[PDB]
Symmetry: D3
């Protein structure tokens, strides 16, 4: 299968030590951004992927292209805006909450945020089995939001990560926009969590929220963080629990869940097995800085699973 994703790629500056940023002296660079992550997770399971995105005529942008290309992502459909810098973020790890991570953005008016419909090729999208985006991409700009609308009307199959970031728009904003998005545009996949449901429908509880989402999506994945995840499908529910593992950095783990789950689905795996394998991509992510350098491979996941009894 072919997955196409659209959204803003980001250069990440990962705090080399935990604690408040004002006391961190070193930052380690990684290529990230949810949709970029989804891509790599997807390819790593044996499939094919592209990204529609804009980066700057800057080292950071050219860094994003080389990195993705190496990973094997089709990038020929990306754009280089010369009037805008690539958007970047900084991760503060384990402070003020242990085990947790916080992102500090420099992306307003980024080249990523200038992703517009004119960048979305009609013939190209029409070739993907799956067109995927997220609440981040809705949030960043109205050009980008329209971009997601264009690629969704063209689509045939759609997947969405609600992926609400309150630093990017009010609970309020996020609610109507996601709700709006789901009026038109029925979804093949819908990836979310307890929190986004608390926003979108004010409904903290998993199976409830899932029943409220399921007129708009065939499959729902509840990310549950440390405790794992739940897949809802065919009027059935399967919970797949967590593993206990050193936590270096939580950022990227949601994507590792999603990208991997989508890809193994398209490799034929029964839903229980797909979520299960993806839970291991998630567990592996948690234990390094970098959203993408720990993403495993169907062989790697299997290894992980065999030696865990």
């Amino acid at each position: 299968a072919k997955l196409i994703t659209l959204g803003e790629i980001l250069i990440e500056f990962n705090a080399l030590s935990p604690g408040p940023l004002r006391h961190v002296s070193y930052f380690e660079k990684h290529v990230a951004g949810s949709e970029a992550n989804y891509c790599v997770a997807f390819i790593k399971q044996g499939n094919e992927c592209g990204i529609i995105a804009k980066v700057g005529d800057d080292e950071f942008g050219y860094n994003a292209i080389e990195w993705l290309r190496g990973q094997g992502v089709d990038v020929s459909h990306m754009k280089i805006d010369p009037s805008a810098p690539t958007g970047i973020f900084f991760i503060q790890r384990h402070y003020p909450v242990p085990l947790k991570s916080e992102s500090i953005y420099y992306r307003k008016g980024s080249a990523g945020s200038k992703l517009s419909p004119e960048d979305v090729d009609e013939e190209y999208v029409k070739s993907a089995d799956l067109v995927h985006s997220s609440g981040i991409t809705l949030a960043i700009s109205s050009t980008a939001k329209e971009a997601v609308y264009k690629a969704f009307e063209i689509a045939s199959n759609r997947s969405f990560d609600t992926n609400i970031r309150l630093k990017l728009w009010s609970a309020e904003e996020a609610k109507r926009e996601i709700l709006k998005l789901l009026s038109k545009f029925h979804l093949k996949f819908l990836i979310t969590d307890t929190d986004d449901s608390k926003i979108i429908l004010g409904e903290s509880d998993p199976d409830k929220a899932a029943k409220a989402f399921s007129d708009y999506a065939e499959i729902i994945v509840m990310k549950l963080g440390p405790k794992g995840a739940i897949v809802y499908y065919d009027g059935k529910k399967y919970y797949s629990s967590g593993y206990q593992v050193p936590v270096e950095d939580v950022t990227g783990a949601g994507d590792a869940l999603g990208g991997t789950f989508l890809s193994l689905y398209y490799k034929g795996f029964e839903m229980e097995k797909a979520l299960d394998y993806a839970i291991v991509a998630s567990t592996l992510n948690v234990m390094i800085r970098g959203d993408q350098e720990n993403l495993p491979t169907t062989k790697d996941i299997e290894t992980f699973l065999r030696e865990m009894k």
Copy 2:
């Protein structure tokens, strides 16, 4: 409220890896000393603080001054001494006991040890609401010990952290010297732990030690380790339990606890909350190399508590 502490500021050279020091290659520098940790912990709750301390006319002395200034500490009452070096110590982490840390001192005849009564100024000393010192200060030199006597016979309110180090003096001597101190000055706060209590009283039971201690101290803090703390005020007893958190280096945590506790008391939190809040501080502290770089603001503490329900 204004706090005034007297003691030795030290420069810390923290093993960049666990293991016996003869195979550690890299050392990371931090500013510390229990009283200085107290200071910053304290100001991180919006009260004021100063320190009476001597450092050398050397780069490390100035490190100490720059760091603490940065932090908003009152350093204008510090002494610079051309005749002696600033005190330093190395930290051997997690070897030969996992979780534990060990100090290796190079402080004999330091600038800090030549802290004397002529340094403690009566007009500065009255004008604190709290004057605080520790057993390390009673131990490092007879002039420093005389300094604590002077500062206490002016103070009106006092706080002493027993803080016994068998590397600086015998269990025996320390009992004798702490009992003598407690004899001649009544305390508003006593901060200690199960270990110092066995050394002073023959009692390791917090409740039983708290009874023996309470003739000399109005509020008592029984640091219980990873198990947490218990405060004893006006007949009541309140145990507040610890947290499981990765441990990088405990050096510092005790002080983070004491200093936050004292500050939140002046801010107006009832004892139970003050202890709760102090535990998070000591809890966070443990997770990094360095005694002060991790100390939480009152807001930062609340973020911790909310995200733990």
Copy 3:
């Protein structure tokens, strides 16, 4: 002497290796920004200084206050904007030009640039012997350019570093605005260079630009970069040559010069001995990453001269 400078404190992520950032993995954090570097250069020669600046209500904002309070700079008239972030930048080093350094700005619409006339309280300002700002301050925004206009009109005595950054505005914008500033407001001190001089006047000979500028300034410093500096006062001319010294990061170094020089003037120093010294401060800057960590004490500059014979 008191100096008050009016500017944007930036946060610096210095590339740990030379080369295009896209292949540089580690960035090292520093507090910087022209006016910031002038303050601490000024203080190190035993004079006093303060800064009018706006920061974000974020980890970097506090980074800059902590650092500068740390260095003895008055930070009690810095403002905090809860609505915009602290301005940052990256340095690319020796690529594609040996010895040279590039700044990559994430500072459009930062807190730092919301610096406004309303942040310049006159009671504080007329307390200064000398009010300094730069072209950086003019270029960043209108509101910040106006803050210079205000401050400069309360100011009895005035200092200006042209410090034209072509990434921030166009050569013609520079030329109009620096001229327009120099129309109102006469200057005790003008700091600039050959290249800024071509952009401004059309004159790149040190003397001819000097003579043309000597209408608007009592004392003029021409930064020559590697070859040193020249000073022009009272129809005299003095050239002090630079030092051959290994280059790590050239950024910070003109600031090292002007700040040192300004301070030495106020100490009683010959104009020529004040330049000689400021030169050494300049050359020391170039050997490390970070604009400020290498700024010399007067006694320190004296050791350098003594040792060079």
Copy 4:
């Protein structure tokens, strides 16, 4: 008491970060190899040790010699082969299986594989109390295997560590060759585990495998990795359990246990106390990169033990 071992020493290149080697940019160097490791654990309990091994005439070889010689190991019977390089390997830690490390060998044709009977002097071996080797030595090459044969026909007492490595030879081969070696050559000591027991004996039960092994060996030690170990000797059996501790790098833990155990037996420890003690050498190992730098002294082990009641 003199221990002589016979094996290949390897230079270790340990990943500085978990994760697949293809996204790891730094490797930390250490001296290791099973018998080298045994050597140090043996000496750290206050007995003497020598090693018969062959290194390249290169930087890595001299690295082996220098390190061991600093440790106190007799290196006067090592060999420097100029036509083959010192063998090395890479450790990938925690990927794709958490808490586990994987060795990636670059050792075929190495100086270390060119160990031969000509390299083992009869007068040397004769004055050892214990001659020890492993199935690694046995598996690297014919010449190295043959050396173990020459040594063991000289040795009055023998020790052996099954240490099966599947990347070095097939399970069937390992089974044949270790069986061949245990019939002829009665062992004072067999160090092994549950995994090797399965390969050699069909049996994975510790009790039934020990039973199967007692025809060959007087004392038997069953490593249980994290669960502790069992020692079997004259009808007795004794299980000593393990410790919950952070895991940096599990490689080398096994040698730490066998070597500490052998050494304390000659210090006249009772078998139960010897294992108890050795489990702590094992557990300390796990906590760092490096097979040898953590190796506890008898004193250090007692500290660990006393500070755990």
Copy 5:
């Protein structure tokens, strides 16, 4: 234009610090190998390239593929061998000769050494403006040498860098094979240096060596280390000097000259602009660890040139 090179890609382990490897604890990983370097430097000038090589089916192998695909190199024609590992080497720097670097190999029977005629295919090679290889490829093994021969007899025009490595073969072994290969096959380009010329022809002086070599090739590039390079397009003779510049790691330097030079030729550049441009690429290289991270694009060479006035 389309370039196809063939030979061994390597993973390079750069000593993080100068000095003998025995005393260096950290190693930086880079992707290297001559023909791989040429590849990137080439595509950098806006041309197309491919590489025929065989890597291990291991982490180090995919590290290679991922890197080179990222750089834009066509990798679809690379082969993966599971019976052998990817070749690697370590770089010792500035010891015992300053400014020089020393490569220590572990490549024997590597998967790259198992390049064979069967891997190079007619169609791919017949569709290429230049086929390039090197003496390292002739020297790693016969199947590899055989590979060059197959590829040369298909190639329109051929390019070859003598690149004599003495750790790989003897002097007389080099002389015979380069001459043997040059006796069949007219090269379009012959890149070599003074040293290699004394081995192949007898002749230390470049002017005599190029005359000697005009009996085999159209254009001859004489690398002259830091003195620069000479290019002999016959009749004429273009020397371009080097640039004094801090030297981190000289390895990769000559490759950078080679690859940049051949590319700019294919873009219309008069011989002397090409060597000048190629010199800056070679001189930018010398100044980082890594053979390919500093390879400049054409604009980047131009910037270097505008700014050196």
Copy 6:
């Protein structure tokens, strides 16, 4: 031959970056100390050596022993002291003077300073062809001074590096003591420099000072830093110039020359050659942090000499 040195080993903590120690974050552990340096330089040429020194019963002392054992130094005649800690010092680099390095001591009352006569043994000391030491050993205490004097009465051939250190004793003190030491004990070798001659003789001219020194030493070595050194023997003066070379850390370089020059003498080398080689030892040293790790071998020195044409 055999060299016995008599002095203080010290652990050295080398600033990982240049600049004032108060802004440096990391230190790199190194084993150092003048006499210990001489030993390793000496052994590098193929001679024996031992050190008579005293260290603490600590990690750091044990660090000193292990390291020197590895290097091949006879340490059987060292002592360990329960009452005192191993001396240590810090290096500050290139600040405030480029190229130069400053040492910051923590050595008063160190185990090392408690070196005394009874530690120097007669049979041991007369099994050497040369007995060596320095001003550092004379300054550190009465007892170590005393011990030099006893080594020297025992010895027939003796060596003295004047090695004046002004943070250790006043100038008038060094003159007095060095001169009263030369007042008995004619010496085989006097190793000094130009500075040490202003202090001791009042004489900065190498020729004039060697003539003043000639009635006290058969052979005189005058170190010229980067200029080189002069050896004075049998009425002949040979000047040997130095090399341009990146400077990282000068400390260690004097000893590299001394130790290397001594060793080669005993190795038979013609004097000029012996001093030629010493220069390269002393010139390699300077380009790394760490007094010992760069110490060249004879073969290594000749590689330097060959590959400088």
